[PDB]
Nucleic acid binder design. Structure first.
Ligand code: MG
Ligand code: MG
Ligand code: MG
Ligand code: MG
Ligand code: MG
Length: 155
RNA sequence: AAAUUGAAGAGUUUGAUCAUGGCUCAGAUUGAACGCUGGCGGCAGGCCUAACACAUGCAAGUCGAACGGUAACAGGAAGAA
């Protein structure tokens, strides 16, 4: 039932006496379709070993986001290295309109209706990093009520 | 009752990387042209250039119920046949 998505595969290279050593990298996300998302990143000489190492990482290192009927609480900004990220809770019917890197994160997360956009570097590893943290710092109508010490209508 | 209730990214500097930064692509749009091709219809559009120059026709007339009027054609008439 966990949902897992392959976001990007890439070839890097290391240089030695004999020449270049080629390897691969894999960036993935797993999610429970109901408010939990992890991302993983693995390296290996062959692609399958890399796509597999990443899922393994993605399964742990997983976090919770305070969803709201399949959509977000409030607009949110996320940032990590080059990537400035922005997300909005859209009305019902829209679905996920977003770049590939973000769509995969939001899909597996369970965010059903959102407007998203990535600014600056669309480098996938940092875009997803920035989205996860955005969702993670995203606070909930109940916690702000708890924080402020009042269960007014706003609860 | 309804009536802006909406927003995607990709390639390319490096051995590889992240950042910076330009170039390039996917989209809509057009009073278009050219190349290949071309059956019918409805609705629209059609000198963007030389406010360059223009043969010919046509594009501003109408009223005899303002007026003297008859030259055309149309009848009518004492009177010519
Ligand atoms: Mg940039
Ligand atoms: Mg090279
Ligand atoms: Mg022809
Ligand atoms: Mg016509
Ligand atoms: Mg003309």
């Amino acid at each position: 039932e966990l949902q897992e998505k392959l976001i990007a595969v890439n070839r890097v290279s290391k240089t030695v006496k004999g020449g270049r050593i080629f390897s691969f990298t894999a960036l993935t996300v797993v999610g429970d379709g109901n408010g939990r998302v992890g991302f993983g990143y693995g390296k290996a000489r062959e692609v399958p070993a890399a796509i597999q190492k990443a899922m393994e990482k993605a399964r742990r290192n997983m976090i919770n986001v305070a969803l709201n009927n399949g959509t977000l609480q409030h607009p949110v900004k996320g940032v990590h290295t080059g990537s400035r990220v922005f997300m909005q809770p859209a009305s019902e019917g829209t679905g996920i309109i977003a770049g590939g890197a973000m769509r995969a994160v939001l899909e597996v997360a369970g965010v059903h209706n959102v407007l998203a956009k990535a600014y600056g570097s669309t480098n996938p590893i940092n875009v997803v990093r920035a989205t996860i943290d955005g969702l993670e710092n995203m606070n909930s109508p109940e916690m702000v009520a708890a924080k402020r010490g009042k269960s007014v209508e706003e609860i």
